[PDB]
Every structure is written in structure tokens, then in C-alpha cells.
Structure 1
């Protein structure tokens, strides 16, 4: 609550210096009026505030909007810092002690479990990130300045300077345009998510483990965690996922996957280069002695004058510096090899001259470790050496594995053209049992099918291309090959074919994507049918993985229905696997907002059926969230902490399995929910009309968050639209009726709901999330958009919804036993209280802007300029909307999303 006033005060001043009191006063007022609204709760303020803003001139409007955006951002920044300081002044050491003590588990059990556990976090570039790298940068700088600013040992002059620092970064950020003017490229996006790896996660992982070691010893286990074990791994979709996005061509993958390999190569060099300086021992293994001597006579060259450190030949007097040096040289060709490959077509540098596999890079390293531990000096080995070893297992030769995605109907096109051409029918019109026949005969065969004279097609080729590249690059640089909207088992085979048929060394594994409601239901079906194919079941080798999507599930049905459906689905799927003895691991397509399956990490894991993780899980970090989770130091350390602590516990101390009673009621409710949902968003004709009216869903594409070039469509904008209007329709629409039903059915059921909310994790967490949403909603604000945009005829329709909101919230609070929303979290409300008034301003602002943009005959009374006098307006060359209107709008969305902490 302190830093808040600090960052804000600072900003307000800069504002005044750059633009003069007049304007600083305006922003100052807006807050006041919004306050009276958020405080006394009198709706007259919103209308008054509206008069204040509709008068502003283009430049002032763009400024005013921008001003609130920055203040809001700052708020979030202050909050992070405050959270960090507090909580230091959850934790594995905790969960271990708790598991061993309370739950009582042999430390060996823990240790083992820990060893056999792996949480793969895959970053994805879903258009969920609003801020641009430019501002995200200034932020990390302000965070850092704000921290050192609270240093309890900095002199006077010291502080004085740090302050000046904080201010100019604030001003610099204020001075840059936050409206990304062009759509990013797939390569640019990968360069974004990558920034975190070589800036916070790279040197983070090793530290995280050091703590996981300290913890282990604190529980008795006087043994560090083996460096080969990898508790957490990072994968990426930036460059691999090409579903619905034509811009991710097969070359884009070569480039991004090559560039990433160069970065790793580069990082490790700094590692080794120094490591050499540290391992200056001479007492070595009988084994290392040999290995070293050989490299001594083999090199013989020392003329490397361009080497800053360790230029002339290293004497065998320093055994490790010898091997390390070698490893380094090979590392340079690996970096340069890639450079050329990227720059020109090829490289003079030979394949054998560089590292092409992880084993090739480990053998030398591992050697030093053994040598050290053997010749005594183990501790010296457990130092920087142990850290590097861990990095290699976590990051490997290409910072992160790359997944691949593509809707199967594309694979059908390819396979169909191949059959048509060869004169053997239309694979398309083939019955599933027929396709499985042909496809299985082929997989068993030995004779090539891919005809060289095959008639290509931009897409029929774009897909073959992808596969080829998969063959070019190493086997390790890739993750699984996901098949969007793929149903029948033939769909998984058609890919198994193309992989080998397009020549692929170690064909990557195939994993289906069950997201649409329907697919999630018939999910355990296709799953079993697939384990019934001998060939497959045989090449699979026990290990199997399937991806479950959280976004579209509740888009076509309720949130409640979907939430339960995904539970059931991954619940059964876990048996259809257990029955066929396959280690099925689930890939969770969790978003940023609760509406798309998001929410606190430990809670989300706890809400998953018992016995369906067992130390193996993949989870998506959608764009925006990457910032949230690994933006800072401590932040990253928490995300890693959180994930492994939850996954570990969910295994050795599973959640409760739903009582038969609950299941029945749950299944029954889910129906009511979906019937309630589809009834209004689907069955109601004029709904969509009302939808594209009371919300800025239409203007979503203007922000330019991604590189993807209507009722039945898109989900990110869907969630977004109501998050802006602060209504959250989608997140709760079902729940209203689902509850009233279980009660109107039998009065005693109410006591059941209360029973569930108190004993069933899935259910408590599900409700607990909806409370947070309601805590960020405001039917008042929703009404304003209605009144201003929604037509007269359907005006009353809005009110109905407005009522369902309230009704659902009461029911929600009763079941939970809360007399007040977020009655549980006091600080979470404190924050809101400070924020809300700023958000409410941007709301009213957005509301009237849309009003002006849509109704060109909406008269307004223009006020006199405020800022000291525009090119600020000329920043948007050709705009379809009049003057400041566009930029202003993009700004409001930018900020409202900021204050809310969520884009979509």
C-alpha cells in the first residue's frame, strides 16, 4: 500500500512536468469521481465522469487514457514487490516435512517419488499478452529498482540515485507508444517467450534444485537429488503449433529451432569458459588422466589468439582444464555452425566438429564429476559442475523441446491425394475400419507410397514440408506431434505413416487434442479403440500421452458442465490406460483466466482426479501468464516451487474421490447448467446481437497480440469481451440454475452441496474460483454498456442476465458460507479497492468511445486542450475511426485488461 503511492506519486509528477498541472488535475479528478462511485456507490458519478471524458480533445484523450494505463500497471508492479517482501519476511521443505510428518511417509518414499517426477511446462504464444516487450522491459527495471530502493543498507547518495533511476524508467515507459502497430511474427513471438529462458529460468533452475537439495537433507535424506533426474522441463509451441496459423511455415520452424540451438550453445560457452577457471585441480581419476593426455597430443595447436581466455595450449598439468577446453572448442563450432546455417545455406564447419547429441556433451562432463568424487574432491564437484550438469538435462542442446500441432483433416488431405494419384480410391470417403486396414497394412509394409510425381498444393505441401524439416533437425529438438480435432484412431495412424514415409529418424510420438465438449465425452472411447491396435500398442511401448483442452470445453456448454466433464474425461481415460498397462500422461491446456481453465497452480492440481498424475504432467503457459510466472527472480522461483510441491503431494496424498451421492448430483446439475447456458447464448436468437453490442468483442483484433491472420467461433475474445465489461457472463452462466435445481428438487440437497464444498477439492476449488471472479465483477458497470450501446428492444434482455448474475452470486455465497465475497482474503480486496476506481474510469471511457465510434451522430461538447499542446495523433496513419477514438480504445482495452490482471 506504500509503493503504490510511491510509484503513483512519482508518475503524477512526471506527468505534470511533461504536460502541465491542468492535465495532472484531470487524471486526479477522474479518480475522485470514480471513487464516489466505488465508495458511496451512487450511479450519478458514472454519468458525470462520462461528461468529463467525452469533452476531451484527441490528444488529451489519448493522454488521459494512457495515463490511467500506466498508473494501473504501476499498481500491479507495486503489488508484486509488496507480496515478495511480506511473505519472505508453497514451499517444498514444507510439503516434505508435512508429507513425512503429518501424512507420515518414509523419506525414501518421498525421495524416490521426487526422482520419478517431472513437470513439463510448455510456453505457448496464445494472444493473451497485452503489454509489449518494450513496456515489459521497463517493468522488470522498475521492479528491480523498487526492491533495491528498500535496501536497508544503502547510503543517502545511493538511494538518491536509485530514485532518479526509477523515475526516468517511468518516464521512458510513459514516452514509448504502447499500441503495437503491426502484428508480430512467429519468429518474433518465439523471441519473446525465449527472453525468459535466457534471462531468468536459465540461471534459476540450478538454484531451485540447490534448495530442493537443502530440503531433502532437512528431512534426513543426506543425498542431493541426482543430476540426471529432471523435476521440471520446458517445451514450446512458438514455431511448432501450426494449426489454423498459415504463417508458421515449415521454414519458420527450421529458423526458430536453429536459432534456439545457437542460443543454448552460446549460453553453455559462458558456463564452460568460466568453469575452466574454477576446476584448476591436478589430482584426477586414473581414467581422466588418459582421456586428458590423448587430447593433449591431438590438439598440438595453440595459435588461437582471438580467445579472450585460455588461448595458448593448456598443459596436461591441469587435467580438467584440458577436457573442458576441448568441450568448449567443440561448443564454438556448434554456435557458429548454427550461425552459418542460419545466415547462409550451409556451414564450412563439419557435423562431427560440433555437438549433435546430448550424450556427446555429457560423457566429458560426467567424467569430470566422477574423477572429482573419486580423487576425493567431491564437494568441489558438487559446485558449479553439478549446476551445469543439471542444466544439460533440463535444457539440453536446444533450450526447449518444440511441440508440433495441426488439425488432422489436413493429414487426411495429404493421404487422400496420395491414394487418388496412385489410383487406389479416395482415402477421404473411406470408412474408419477401411482406413485402419490400409493404414495398418502400410505401416507393416516396406515399399514407399509417397510418389515423386505427386501433385503438390500450397497446403498439401506445407504439411509435407513440416515433416521433412522434422527429419532435417536433430531428434531431440522436438516434443510430441499433436493432432487438433482428431477423432478416430485412423487419425493417429495417418500421422505415424507420414512421419516415416517422409523419412523421420526417431518419429516423434503422437498425442490427440480433446477440447470440444463432444470430443471430451467420447474421449475414453477413441482412447481405448487406439490401444486395441497391436501395431500401435506395440510401438507405443507403454508410455502414452493425451492432451485435454480447457478453453472450448466450456464455450459450447457451461463452465460448470465443462469443469466436471474434463474431470470425468481424464478420470476414465486414466483407467482405459491402467487396464492396458500404459503410463498415460495428460497435457493440460490451461489458460490464464478461470474461464479458460486457469487459476492458482496448487489449487488447479488439487482439483484433478486422484491417481492421474503420478509424477508426469504437461501444462501450457499461455502468452500473458509467462510474464506473470517468470517475469522476475522470486516469481520464477515460486512457479517452480508451486508446481513440484503440488504434483508431489497430489501423488503421495491424493484428493478424495467423489462420493456416489455427489457424482449423481454433479452429473444432474451439469445438465441443468448446460441447458441454462446454451439456452441463452445459443437458443436465444437476438443474443449474439446483444453480445456484439454490450461488449468490445469486435475491437479485439486491433491490439495485435498475435500472428493469426462468427457465433461458432473463437474463445479468447469470448472470455475477454465480458472481462472488459466486468460482467463475466461465461464463467457463471450455468451455475445459477444448477444450484437452484438441486434445491428445488429436494431441500436436503442444500446440505449436500455444503458437504461437498467442505470435503471435495474439485468442488471447493471450482466454487472458490467463481468467487474471485464475482469479486472482480460489477453488474453496475455491465449496465452502463447496456444503457449506452444495447438497443431498446433487447435492453430488458440484459436486465434478465443482470439478475441471473446476482442470483447466482447469492447461491454461491450460501453454499460456501460467506457473508461477504472474498470474505476469506482481506488483502485481495484491499488491492481491488485501490484499483477499481481507475478501472471504472477506463470503463466509462471505453463505453462512450464505442458509443461515439458506432453512432457518428452522437453529439458531444468539445473542451479546450489540457496538455501543453498533434503528432501523438499522427501516430495512427490511416484509421477507420475518427481521430483519437481508435488509439484511445486500444488503450482502454490495454488498461482495463491490466487492472483486471487478465486479457482473456
Structure 2
């Protein structure tokens, strides 16, 4: 309520009483709809929207969008405060009490536990960063306000500050007028490091240490223990995105490296200031004397502090002073290498190794601990240690992704130019034999004179860029649409042949349901190749996509097949004695495998993680989980706690009756899904009309330029905007009804399954949440306003199934806020605006001094396109999910 009157006061101070009154009326009508649920109100509301001027409608959509965002920040502040006035400690206590597990078991499993969070630039972040920062300032002011230690004048100053920050957010054009470059996406992603993650990681480790001491473990978490890691796809994932050129990958690698160098350099001078002790071992004494021998008695005027040669009285300052020299030259080199194509800085003057950096700091730690100064060592020096051993010389290791067909094109050009055949036409067997003979052979393959296409040269040049850059700046090479060992061996061959000194691991991505059903067989065949099993060194990573699985088949069928896939992949890896780490391509929306993280981890089959996890963070989720101190801490918290329990507390393994039951149920679910999304021939026609899917690309979120043949992100987006959520719940109705029809005691067995099998419980509960965010009257309005009089009953069929499915869900679970008002308003505005857009009549270097002049190149009516983009932004904000 406070955010409303504040906002409306600013809106009145910027646009007059009349417009604020119109917004107020819209809120009242929307309130009567979300209250009495009379559909008449919707039309009663729509009328008020038709009269609105072209500029005024833009102001209205702006207003309800910004109020939605303010509601989000309010929610975060209230959650943080209500939580603070009162998990890791709880998880430890439960693991000790419930499962009789000892503290040293928790500590040992915790040391050998790894959580690899990889950030992606998938176009799901609706709000632009220019406005996101303002959101951060607003939640900062609100956090300082929701408190009871305000000193009057401080409250007044924070009031003026919050007012000017809201006014600043409203005075920015929220619409990206040009799509970002991949470099811009990488910048937006990495901004969360030098603001939250960089300082958040040491604090999190310290909290884990405190809990461990609350279990009786005086020992501390080893600094080199990889409890959490950060990887990135920004600038590396080039699947379907030709804008990710090789030069882009070079750009993001040199970029991240220069950011890291800058951070370390800013930290090191203060660290030198603190380490003012004089007691050290004989070891550190000898090393510091070594540095003081080649001390370079010079002016050293390029530094501000400590420009005089550091005396041996304070040896830690000697050693860390050398660390500072190598950090200054590492930063200077990375800066020149980035800006210009070259550097005169000697490589020996920098840090080239991941732990050439660590060695001196490790030595200082050993010294402090040996001389009795361990408390001092477990302070800034330990924080710095963990920062190094977590972020390294380049904050994130970069992943590369590419579809198999491009590798096949390359190899085909290679075999054709070598006059040995055509790799494409070759069977799988031939590919394996040839690739193996070339991998074990010593003769070069292609040459400088290979006829290459722009695509072929793209992939080859990416491998050359990988070869030219340091090895610790890269992660894994992920193959999209991977089906056979020949694709992996193809990437290994292309890597070695492009002279990649230290080749990075190859990892398959199984995302389509057909690939997940047959994935364990393929991975087993890959492990059958002795050369590959002997190079892989007992470690293998495989990616498991979630977006496209629930797109071609049902959501239920996709979830179940994902579970089976994980289980049998672990079975294969155990059969070959290989440590398997699985890479979960989870989204933000439940339709693409999203949901609460700990529920997603618990819903994984037991003994499939084993202290090694890898999860994607799709663009928008980055802000959701790292935009504030508290959010980031809750992130590392939820991940490590859920993983640790799933390691020591295995989820129940499904009873065989549950196996057969979910197999049949999955068959019925897939038939029910493809029945309405593929068998119905008019379905695509109805979809392109009842949802705002086509307009998604207008938001310019990402850098990426048949319903089966579309991306999963706008697929979930379309049914999310209309608040119908078809892909989330479709198959479940017919699945359940067929299971109770076949047998009546299967109702007792469904009740049995919901209360003991975590996978089933999590799935059903997610569906119930999605129903809590849905309203069929909205989709009904979109149909009535945009779907032709013809196939009106079609949607009604769906609407029937909608309610039909929901009644079943609660029947298994045993079951019988205010922001939805704004969401409804924006829904109506979107429907009417779409009706005016798909009309012929409203189809068409100066400055701009009003909203209508912000879109000069709009094919649609002056004020319409901006209003549409505003509606999509606002609805996505209210639902806290884009796609």
C-alpha cells in the first residue's frame, strides 16, 4: 500500500490528477474482477482502455508495469525481513539427529561436494539492466526503510532518495530499441560478480564454517575445496546464434580475465596493509629474503601506496608486495590484450598458472598458522584465498556449445577435399572407425588450402580461438543434438587437429525426448571405445536439457523420462567405473524445468549427484538469485544444503508398481498432449491468435536473430502471458483419469505415491502452483477478442480440460496478495491492443520530447507497438516469469 501512494504521488506530479484517477479506476475494476470473478467486469474494464489517447495508453501501461516491479521489490524486502527476525544449521542438525550421521561424515561429504553454477544468456530477462540497477537502488532504500532505527532526518533523506529513484526509473525508456550483442549479454551477466558474488562467496564460506563449529568441527573448510564454482555460456554458446562469432569468444575471454585482474589488484593493496606481523617460519623468512634480494631498489612510482622497497621487518608485506607486482602486470597485460591485439608485457611478469597465484598466499597462510596467528589467517587472507580458488584468473570458465550437424559439415568437407568419400553419407560404424584411426594417427588432417564455407570457417576459427587462449579460461564443449559417439569423437578430432594444446572435455546435450529415451545406450557405446575411456581419465560430464523435452511430448512424460534417463546414465557410469557429473539445463519457468531449486534437487533419483552437480541459470534467473546480498547467500545456501542432503539422505527409490504405473500414465499423457498440439490441424492457427507468441521477438532481450519447430522459450512465454499455462498441465488430466478408470484402487495407489515418492510429490505440487497462477477467464477473453467466431469451442475444450485437470491434481494432493489486479489490467490492455494491431487501419535524425516520438520506425500505429511491448514486460513482471 505504501508503494502505491508513493508511486501515484510521483505519477500525479508528472502527469496530473486526471491520469492518476484513470489508473485508480482501472485498479478498482480489476479488483472487482479478481474478487467477484464476474467476467462482465473485464469488458467493463476494456471500455475504459479504448478511450485512452495514444500517449496516455503508453503512460497507463508504464504505470502498471512499474507498480508490478515495485511489488516484486516489496516482496523481496518483506521476505528478507520476516526471515531475519527469527537451511544450513537446520540441515546439519537434521542430518545428525534423524539419520544418525556423524559430524565428520557431514564434513567429509561436504569437502568432496561440488556445485557448478553456470550462467547463460538465454533471452528470458525482460527488464533491461539500465532499469535493473534502479530497481537495486529502490530495494536498497526500501530495505533501509523497513526498519525501526531510523533517525528522523535519515528517514526524510531516504524518502527523497526513493522518490527520485522511482522518478528516474519511470523517466527511462523501458523498451530496448536495439537487441544486445553477445558481449553486452556477457557484461550484464558478469556485473553480478563485481557487485555481489565476489564478496558473497567468502561470506558464504564463513557461514558454513560457523555452522560446522556449531556441530563441533573446529576445523575450517579447506580454501581449495571446490564447494561452489561459476561457469558461463555468454559468448560461448553459439547454437543457432550466428552472432556469437569466434572474435566474440575472444572478446568475452579477455574481458572476464581483465575483470578478475582488476578485482584482485584492488584487493591486494589493502591486504598488504593488514599483514603487518613480523613472526614467520624459516620458510617464509627464506622466501621473503629471496624477494628482498631482487628487490629492485627503485622509485616504483606507478603505485600510490608502498612505492618504496618493502623492508624485511614485515615479511608478509614483502611476499604480498611481489604478489602485487605480478597482479599489476597481469592486469596491464589483460588490458592491452583486450584493447589492442597484442601486448609487450612479458608473460613471466604475470600469473600464468591458476596457482602460481595461490602459492605465495598459501605460504602466508602456513606461516600465520605455524606462528600461532591462525585467527589472523582465517580473516582477509582466507577470504582472498577462497576468492582465488573459486574465481581463478578468469572469473568463470567459459562453455562452448554447437550443434552436431555443423561438425558433420566440417568433417564432410574434410573427407571430400581429401578424396576419401563423404562423411555425411557414411554410416555410424564408418565414422567411428575413421575418427578413431585419425585420433590415434600422427599425420595432420586438413591443410591451409581446405575449401571452407562461412559456417565451416566459423567452427574451425572457434577452435583456433580456443587454441590461442589460455586453457583455464574454458570449460566444456557441449554438443547439441548429439546421438552417437561419432559426434563426440568428431569434436575431439577437430580439437586436436586445430592444435588445441589442452583439449577441453566433450559433453553431449540430450534435449529432445527421443534423445533422452536412448541416451544411456549411446553413452554406454561411447564408454565402450577404449581409446576414449582411456583419455577421459575416469571423469565424464553429460548435459540433460529440460526445455524441448516437455515441448514435443507432455510435461509429465518429459519429467518421467528425465528421471529414468538420469537413473540409467548413473547405472552405465557405475558399470564402466566412471564418475559421472550430470549437467541440468533447467529454466526459470516450470515449463522448461524450473521451480524451487531444492525441490528440483530432491526430485532427482537417489545416488545420481554424489557431490558433483551442474545447473544452468537462465538469464532472468540470474537477477532472481544474485541481485542482492541476501538473494546470493540464499542461493549458495539452498544449493549446497539440498545437494548435501541428497547425498546423505537418499530419496526413496520407486516401487515397481509405481514404475509400471508411471509408464502407462506417461503413454496416456503423451497421446493427450500431441492430440491437441499436433493432431488438431487448426491448432497452430488458434495458437498464433490466442497468445502473444509472435510478438516475443519485439522485446529485443537476446542477441539471437511449425509449432514443433519453434523455440521452447516463447512457447512457454505464450501460454504464460495469457495465464493459461497449457504446456505445464496438458497431459495430466487424461493420464490420471485413465489410471482411475482402469482400476479403482489406483486412486489409493496415487494417494500412496503422492505422500512418499519425492519425485511425484514435487511434480504434482509444481502443477498446483502453476494453477494458482492461472485464470481461464483471461484466455477466454483473448479468445473472444482475437479468435474468430469459428473455433471458439476449441479453446473451451481446452478450458474444460483445464478445470478437469485441476480437480484431479488436488484430488491426489488432498486439497480443497493483490498484484493479480494489475496483471488483469495489463491482460485486458494486451488483448484489445492486439485486436487493434492485427487491424489494417492502424498500420503504417529528429529528437523525441514525448512518448509517441520514441518509436519512429513502427509499422503499427504510433502509440500501439510500445504499448504492446509494455504489456508483455508488465505481465511477465507480475507473473515473475518470462519463458
**Pairs within 5 Å for 1:18-37:** 18-37=14-33
Q: Once the 2 structures are TM-superposed, how far is the Cα of residue 97 of structure 1 from its aligned partner?
A: 1.2
**Partner residue in 2 for 1:99:** 95
**Partner residue in 2 for 1:172:** 168
Q: Once the 2 structures are TM-superposed, how far is the Cα of residue 252 of structure 1 from its aligned partner?
A: 0.4
8 Å CA contact 2:557, 2:670 repeated in 1: yes
8 Å CA contact 2:182, 2:248 repeated in 1: yes
8 Å CA contact 1:851, 1:858 repeated in 2: no
Q: Once the 2 structures are TM-superposed, how far is the Cα of residue 57 of structure 1 from its aligned partner?
A: 0.8
In the aligned structure 2, how far is the partner of 1:870 from the partner of 1:327? 53
Question: Does 1:660 find its partner at 2:656?
Answer: yes
**Partner residue in 1 for 2:882:** 903
Within the candidate set 347, 350, 358, 2:346 is matched to 350
Q: Once the 2 structures are TM-superposed, how far is the Cα of residue 858 of structure 1 from its aligned partner?
A: 9.4
Q: Write the deviation string for residues 228-276 of structure 1: whole angstroms up to 9, x where unpaired.
A: 1011101000011111111111110111100110110110112111100
**Partner residue in 1 for 2:116:** 120
Which stretch has the larger CA shift, 145-154 or 10-19?
Answer: 145-154
Question: Does 1:877 find its partner at 2:856?
Answer: yes
Question: Does 1:850 find its partner at 2:846?
Answer: no
**Pairs within 5 Å for 1:123-138:** 123-138=119-134
In the aligned structure 2, how far is the partner of 1:671 from the partner of 1:246? 38
Determine helix, strand or coil for the equivalent of 2:408: helix
**Partner residue in 1 for 2:248:** 252
8 Å CA contact 2:268, 2:324 repeated in 1: yes
8 Å CA contact 2:109, 2:611 repeated in 1: yes
**Partner residue in 1 for 2:503:** 507
In the aligned structure 1, how far is the partner of 2:36 from the partner of 2:850? 40
Within the candidate set 504, 513, 520, 1:517 is matched to 513
In the aligned structure 2, how far is the partner of 1:657 from the partner of 1:538? 33
Question: What is the TM-score with the length of structure 1 in the denominator?
Answer: 0.96
Dislocated runs of 4+, deviation >4 Å? none
Question: Does 1:726 find its partner at 2:738?
Answer: no
Within the candidate set 203, 227, 232, 1:231 is matched to 227
In the aligned structure 2, how far is the partner of 1:691 from the partner of 1:153? 54
Q: Once the 2 structures are TM-superposed, how far is the Cα of residue 856 of structure 1 from its aligned partner?
A: 3.4
**Pairs within 5 Å for 1:723-762:** 723-762=720-759
**Partner residue in 2 for 1:315:** 311
Q: Once the 2 structures are TM-superposed, how far is the Cα of residue 299 of structure 1 from its aligned partner?
A: 2.5
Change (3 A) 1:570 1:190: same
Which stretch has the larger CA shift, 184-193 or 466-475?
Answer: 466-475
**Pairs within 5 Å for 1:552-701:** 552-701=548-697
Within the candidate set 88, 102, 123, 2:84 is matched to 88
**Pairs within 5 Å for 1:135-150:** 135-150=131-146
Q: Once the 2 structures are TM-superposed, how far is the Cα of residue 347 of structure 1 from its aligned partner?
A: 1.0
What RMSD, in angstroms, separates the aligned Cα atoms of the two structures?
1.2
Q: Write the deviation string for residues 438-470 of structure 1: whole angstroms up to 9, x where unpaired.
A: 110111111111212111221111111111111
8 Å CA contact 1:90, 1:638 repeated in 2: no
In the aligned structure 1, how far is the partner of 2:810 from the partner of 2:729? 13
Within the candidate set 690, 706, 721, 1:710 is matched to 706
In the aligned structure 2, how far is the partner of 1:560 from the partner of 1:549? 15
In the aligned structure 2, how far is the partner of 1:40 from the partner of 1:345? 66
Which stretch has the larger CA shift, 790-799 or 804-813?
Answer: 790-799
In the aligned structure 1, how far is the partner of 2:523 from the partner of 2:403? 17
**Partner residue in 1 for 2:811:** 814
Within the candidate set 360, 367, 370, 2:363 is matched to 367
In the aligned structure 1, how far is the partner of 2:643 from the partner of 2:305? 44
**Partner residue in 1 for 2:327:** 331
Question: What is the TM-score with the length of structure 2 in the denominator?
Answer: 0.98
Which stretch has the larger CA shift, 695-704 or 709-718?
Answer: 709-718
Q: Write the deviation string for residues 290-317 of structure 1: whole angstroms up to 9, x where unpaired.
A: 1111211212233122322111111111
Question: Does 1:803 find its partner at 2:800?
Answer: yes
Task: Please list every run of 5 or more consecutive structure 2 residues that lacks an aligned counterpart in the other structure.
Answer: none
Question: Does 1:891 find its partner at 2:870?
Answer: yes
Q: Write the deviation string for residues 615-663 of structure 1: whole angstroms up to 9, x where unpaired.
A: 1010000000000001111111001100000000001011001111111
8 Å CA contact 2:551, 2:712 repeated in 1: yes
**Partner residue in 2 for 1:240:** 236
**Partner residue in 1 for 2:183:** 187
**Partner residue in 2 for 1:862:** none
In the aligned structure 1, how far is the partner of 2:811 from the partner of 2:840? 46
**Partner residue in 2 for 1:781:** 778
In the aligned structure 2, how far is the partner of 1:787 from the partner of 1:179? 29
Change (3 A) 1:29 1:870: farther
Within the candidate set 139, 159, 162, 2:158 is matched to 162
Determine helix, strand or coil for the equivalent of 1:235: strand
Q: Write the deviation string for residues 333-367 of structure 1: whole angstroms up to 9, x where unpaired.
A: 11110111111121111111111111211111111
Determine helix, strand or coil for the equivalent of 2:622: helix
Q: Once the 2 structures are TM-superposed, how far is the Cα of residue 870 of structure 1 from its aligned partner?
A: 6.5
**Partner residue in 2 for 1:835:** 819
Q: Write the deviation string for residues 4-23 of structure 1: whole angstroms up to 9, x where unpaired.
A: x1122111000001110000
In the aligned structure 2, how far is the partner of 1:636 from the partner of 1:703? 27
Q: Once the 2 structures are TM-superposed, how far is the Cα of residue 154 of structure 1 from its aligned partner?
A: 2.5
Within the candidate set 484, 487, 511, 1:491 is matched to 487
In the aligned structure 1, how far is the partner of 2:681 from the partner of 2:472? 51
8 Å CA contact 1:206, 1:390 repeated in 2: yes
In the aligned structure 1, how far is the partner of 2:153 from the partner of 2:841? 58
**Partner residue in 2 for 1:827:** none
Q: Once the 2 structures are TM-superposed, how far is the Cα of residue 430 of structure 1 from its aligned partner?
A: 1.0
**Partner residue in 2 for 1:770:** 767
In the aligned structure 2, how far is the partner of 1:24 from the partner of 1:876? 24
In the aligned structure 2, how far is the partner of 1:209 from the partner of 1:488? 41
In the aligned structure 2, how far is the partner of 1:362 from the partner of 1:656? 42
In the aligned structure 2, how far is the partner of 1:279 from the partner of 1:870? 57
Q: Write the deviation string for residues 416-453 of structure 1: whole angstroms up to 9, x where unpaired.
A: 11111111111111111111101101111111112121
Determine helix, strand or coil for the equivalent of 1:620: strand
**Partner residue in 1 for 2:789:** 792
In the aligned structure 1, how far is the partner of 2:814 from the partner of 2:694? 39
**Partner residue in 1 for 2:56:** 60
In the aligned structure 1, how far is the partner of 2:83 from the partner of 2:375? 32
Q: Once the 2 structures are TM-superposed, how far is the Cα of residue 855 of structure 1 from its aligned partner?
A: 2.5
Determine helix, strand or coil for the equivalent of 1:360: coil
**Partner residue in 2 for 1:822:** none
8 Å CA contact 1:697, 1:720 repeated in 2: yes
Number of positions where the alignment pairs a residue of Structure 1 with one of Structure 2: 878
Task: Please list every run of 5 or more consecutive structure 1 residues that lacks an aligned counterpart in the other structure.
Answer: 820-830, 860-868
8 Å CA contact 1:247, 1:708 repeated in 2: yes
